[PDB]
């Protein structure tokens, strides 16, 4: 067909090499969450995801239209959704229900942790890949049981007010 | 040797080692030792002497396949001369095996060798036909034994040349 | 292919069982509703949702750019929208007519009563999983039977507003 | 059927060689990216879009309802969302961290190097094949690892505020 | 040649002992299946299928995508292909024809019934092994008589659907 | 004929030895099969499944659309169909009776046990060899009965799944 | 009868010939299919597929909905159905055991190598036939071993799978 057709190999070839020696892919479903003095019940969560961090773009406009951008202020607050599990007894209610009626703040942590590296007898973290939240504000949401969920058990949704976020 | 290694039953003694499909060398910025002269077709022609060039893709060849046969017969080209002596030198294995062997059946043995060969030869397209039907006839290859005495027995062969096309022209024309 | 990829059991294994001896798994299927004086009725109920619990965040802003969310007043009000089904004559019809004629309030209380734990003659639940609720506004909704509709049979839905939830 | 139905054939015949002979086609998984400075990491990113590129039209209104259409500035800035690959410790995590502690401003080049043409030992890029992006502002968004996400790894967003776009 | 090759003759006494000391087995062929006072039609039967009863199970998932099933209610549902011969008077037809008239649900018991261990006037049954099929719904599929081959008589079938696993 | 055709005895007796050092293989028929404490029906068992073990994959791509995978955790699920053959005493209707009774889990053990391996006064077993299937979920599935066919009896087949592959 | 009937020998003699110029040819039977330095499970393989190397395709139209095709990179994928056959001692459980305990990738070579052709003490291999599949995930697959059947013994598969197809 076209004459700019042929091509060489080495070069995809050591492309693949750099590829492959880049490092071992980490599975999104690898995760660890404990909250503050509730590790013991916070294997229990199955959904979430990692708080969101950006700080915010000014757009100004000058002379002969010119746009530009400008720093701003961290955006380190928002809202997290995450889908969890209850229990025979609902943990998880009692918890929320101390919570709020407590009236306090909480404290989580955040890591991927890979089986492979895991080393002694309960799971090890590194620097790298931990995260702590502070003031966090939890709270559940309404969830709904249909009439064909012979299959499917309740899976309830937290709704969590995230403050500002901090990397050890 | 690259083309008579890219067949391994027959070989390349067919094709000539010219042209930039076979013959390459292209070592590093080629220029004439002296750039007054200049080559002359019947001069290099009548005198056996094979000229360069240079091909499409770039790369410093040569363009010929002239022997030192001086004589202007069919043996001036290099297909010619590495067929028959490719076919002698099967007729020197045969030999070989057949030497010093007792009589009666060895005749016929080497006959089937001789066509089977030739068979193999004319598949590889080595051999061809012969354009005139009238006097060459159709037929590729003959053989022929015969048997004299105790000694003098004789084996004959004949074949047909092939073509390689060396010399082609081209002509233009407006259609108006 | 990746030199960090060669991993440990015992640790995910242990993991294992403390997963399986967490404790059994709920379906969400199973659920039990009564009303106040017509839980004889109550059980034609098939899919609804717990009331959602949540309180509100006030989202404040100070100097130096921070965020801050502080409490609010409990979200205890809201809409829960369930689906039933009726009867030959039209229980729920002459339920909810009666309901708007008398112009009243309603207290109705939902549990989770998993069969293997049941004990007695009737279905008996457990302070954990059982909550009441209080000032619950019913009402019902138009329900379009199409024409293909062969083999679906009439699914009342019907929309409730709820205003603060207590727990026993 | 119709008599207007025959047609000949070296006129498409045709036609269809100087399609075949246009250009060999590009495909739109080939591309390379480099940042400055961190060209050894940015060969993580798999999914981008190139930065859009126009100008805003005045639409004006004349006399007898006339129609009319205007240059005007050019549409230089605006947003990109890419979509990458993150290593073991968090390449780019570390990145964006150090970046929004340095608060600066990077420089990127993107390009497309079909294989066939490459030469030497590096992919070698050609001025018709590349663009420089200047004054551009990098973070990430929150990404949602899921409960069956068991053959899914994490795909991190980045949100990319464009200024000005500069073609060599 | 392969040096582990001694063998001897106990254990396949023993366990042809043991295999042998379970008793004879029921065939396929021999069963009683009748419906509650139609013993006439019931003979009729030519094939079945036996009674089905299971569970409903929930998949959930633990952390890093490992799953769990737990058990639920019982899937009550249950069908069966019913084989019969029809006659000149054509029973069936008339059976056919008398319950779809009636519009009603239909009963059904299900016992292997061995000749062999039958005694008295009429083989004997236990409760061990009866099954019966009550609140049933019977209804006809469409099966082609082959009247190219003439060879076969007419081949009635039937679909038989229980709501629920009646069972001691 | 073809020149490339001389051959030769040494090599086949070589590759000969060779194959034949493995020693005896394995036969399909013999293997044994139980349950936990229950081996008066496990001994019913008819023909099974291997049970498999597994790792999920990740497929991620690299630049211009080459791929890469990489591993994950194990793939626990596990389903078997056990065949048996039914008796006058019904041995699997009275086991499958009792443990959908019971509404609880299974343990299984399936270990291939070689007569002329097998010495002492029962065949015997090594952990090497041993596969043990432990908290698993046995149900029954619709297997049709050929009354037609006479000379067939009775074919009941189960379903067995576990949710983790026990292995040492 | 019809005219064009004539016919003669040399061509099938000139065709004969050309087509027996060729030579022997391979037999699906023999070639050697080997992992990195464990041989002696190795030997235990029955029957493989060929690897396969192919090249993705973009599917582009031109006008009036004429189409063309280009070449893109290569599929580097690449499944393979491995078959063995077990020994009492289990070499095939073994190595599944412990790669599966490594949770690493695996290494294969696979060359036709006809006995005829080999020479030296062990059949002799050149890297034109030569074909070698590294960084393999190797995994099992559910195989139903029939006991019913007894003439035939365990029949073991497994499933390799090769991110890139190795050639020189």
Same mark, same amino acid.
């Given at each position: 067909?076209?004459?700019?057709?042929?091509?060489?190999?080495?070069?995809?070839? !050591?492309?693949?090499?750099?590829n492959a020696?880049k490092g071992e892919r980490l599975v999104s479903?690898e995760?660890?969450?404990?909250?503050?003095?509730?590790?013991?019940? +916070?294997?229990?969560?199955?959904? +979430?995801?990692?708080?969101?961090?950006?700080?915010?773009?000014?757009?100004?406009?000058?002379?002969?239209?010119?746009?530009?951008?400008?720093? !701003?202020?961290?955006?380190? #607050?928002?809202?997290?959704?995450?889908?969890?599990?209850?229990?025979?007894? !609902?943990?998880?209610?009692?918890?929320?229900?101390?919570?709020?009626?407590?009236?306090?703040?909480?404290?989580?942590?955040?890591?991927?942790?890979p =089986? +492979?590296? #895991? #080393? !002694?007898?309960?799971?090890?973290?590194?620097?790298?890949?931990?995260? =702590?939240?502070?003031?966090?504000?939890?709270?559940?949401?309404?969830?709904?049981? #249909?009439? =064909?969920?012979?299959?499917?058990?309740?899976?309830? +949704?937290?709704?969590?007010?995230?403050?500002?976020? =901090?990397?050890? | 040797?690259?083309? /008579?290694? %890219?067949?391994?039953?027959?070989?390349?003694?067919?094709?000539?080692?010219?042209?930039?499909?076979?013959?390459?060398? *292209?070592?590093?910025?080629?220029?004439?030792?002296?750039?007054?002269?200049?080559?002359?077709?019947?001069?290099?022609? %009548?005198?056996?002497?094979? %000229? &360069?060039?240079?091909?499409?893709?770039?790369?410093?060849?040569?363009?010929?396949?002239?022997?030192?046969?001086?004589?202007?017969?069919?043996?001036? @080209?290099?297909? &010619?001369?590495?067929?028959?002596?490719?076919?002698?030198? @099967?007729?020197?294995?045969?030999?070989?095996?057949?030497?010093?062997?007792?009589?009666?059946?060895?005749?016929?043995?080497?006959?089937?060798?001789?066509?089977?060969?030739?068979?193999?030869?004319? *598949?590889?397209?080595?051999?061809?036909?012969?354009?005139?039907?009238?006097?060459?006839?159709?037929?590729?290859?003959?053989? %022929? /034994?015969?048997?004299?005495?105790?000694?003098?027995?004789? /084996?004959?062969?004949?074949?047909?040349?092939?073509?390689?096309?060396?010399?082609?022209?081209? &002509?233009?024309?407006?259609?108006?």
């Open positions: 067909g076209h004459n700019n057709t042929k091509g060489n190999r080495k070069f995809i070839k !050591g492309r693949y090499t750099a020696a479903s995760f660890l969450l404990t909250f503050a003095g509730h590790e013991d019940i +916070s294997v229990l969560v199955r959904t +979430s995801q990692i708080p969101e961090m950006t700080r915010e773009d000014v757009e100004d406009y000058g002379p002969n239209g010119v746009k530009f951008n400008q720093h !701003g202020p961290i955006r380190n #607050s928002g809202e997290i959704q995450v889908q969890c599990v209850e229990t025979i007894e !609902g943990d998880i209610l009692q918890f929320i229900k101390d919570r709020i009626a407590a009236k306090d703040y909480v404290d989580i942590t955040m890591a991927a942790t =089986e +492979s590296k #895991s #080393s !002694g007898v309960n799971a090890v973290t590194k620097a790298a890949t931990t995260i =702590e939240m502070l003031d966090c504000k939890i709270y559940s949401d309404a969830i709904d049981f #249909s009439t =064909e969920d012979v299959t499917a058990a309740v899976r309830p +949704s937290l709704r969590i007010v995230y403050n500002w976020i =901090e990397w050890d | 040797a690259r083309g /008579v290694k %890219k067949n391994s039953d027959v070989g390349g003694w067919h094709y000539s080692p010219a042209g930039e499909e076979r013959a390459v060398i *292209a070592r590093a910025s080629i220029q004439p030792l002296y750039p007054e002269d200049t080559p002359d077709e019947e001069a290099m022609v %009548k005198g056996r002497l094979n %000229k &360069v060039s240079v091909g499409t893709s770039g790369q410093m060849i040569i363009d010929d396949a002239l022997t030192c046969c001086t004589q202007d017969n069919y043996l001036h @080209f290099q297909h &010619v001369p590495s067929l028959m002596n490719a076919i002698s030198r @099967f007729f020197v294995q045969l030999a070989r095996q057949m030497k010093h062997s007792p009589d009666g059946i060895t005749a016929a043995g080497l006959t089937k060798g001789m066509t089977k060969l030739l068979d193999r030869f004319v *598949a590889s397209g080595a051999l061809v036909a012969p354009r005139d039907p009238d006097a060459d006839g159709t037929e590729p290859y003959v053989l %022929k /034994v015969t048997q004299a005495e105790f000694d003098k027995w004789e /084996v004959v062969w004949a074949c047909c040349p092939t073509g390689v096309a060396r010399r082609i022209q081209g &002509v233009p024309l407006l259609i108006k």
